[PDB]
């Protein structure tokens, strides 16, 4: 490891948590600038927006879960920076 990798994991932890929560929020508000980013399909035009909204909800959860992995990288790296 070394203190260098622990500092990298701290920086990646802070940035990752910030940005993945911001994206999780932008997906939760169904933001139009994310229409290309959501993995939509030819069936997600049927009856109304409810189908695409369920995918926006899925990618919103995925981003909040991904921020949780950067919290684990945080806790690990805040150990490693003291252990190395």
């Amino acid at each position: 490891c070394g203190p260098k990798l622990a500092a990298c994991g701290i920086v990646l932890s802070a940035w990752g948590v910030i940005m993945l929560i911001m994206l999780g929020i932008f997906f939760n508000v169904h933001s139009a600038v994310l229409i290309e980013d959501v993995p939509f399909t030819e069936k997600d035009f049927e009856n109304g927006p409810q189908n695409i909204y369920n995918l926006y909800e899925q990618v919103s959860y995925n981003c909040f879960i991904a921020a949780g992995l950067y919290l684990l990288l945080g806790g690990f790296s805040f150990c490693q920076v003291r252990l190395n």
């Binding site: 940005m19 993995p39 995918l55 899925q58 879960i65 991904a66 992995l69």
Partner: protein
């Protein structure tokens, strides 16, 4: 040069989004969360190396190029001896 560097920086960032971050989004929670973590870590590494370091140094030097040349050459004559006093403060 202002426009030129801005377009490069913006489109370098755009492609780094388009063929990294976009790939991490998936229709299942576990696969999406894991994909996003590794994809964004790769994005951060490349974003730092290309944009924050290398295009940072480019914009640093070009901003100073415009500043030293196409600004300062209108008024700063820039010819003279540096003040180098004889002192015990150099000990």
């Amino acid at each position: 040069r202002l426009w030129a560097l801005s377009l490069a920086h913006a489109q370098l960032s755009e492609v780094l989004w388009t063929m990294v971050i976009h790939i991490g989004l998936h229709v299942r929670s576990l696969a999406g969360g894991l994909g996003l973590f590794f994809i964004f870590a790769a994005f951060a590494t490349l974003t730092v190396a290309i944009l924050l370091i290398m295009e940072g140094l480019s914009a640093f030097l070009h901003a100073l190029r415009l500043h030293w040349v196409e600004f300062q050459n209108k008024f700063y004559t820039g010819t003279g001896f540096k003040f180098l006093p004889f002192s015990f403060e150099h000990i």
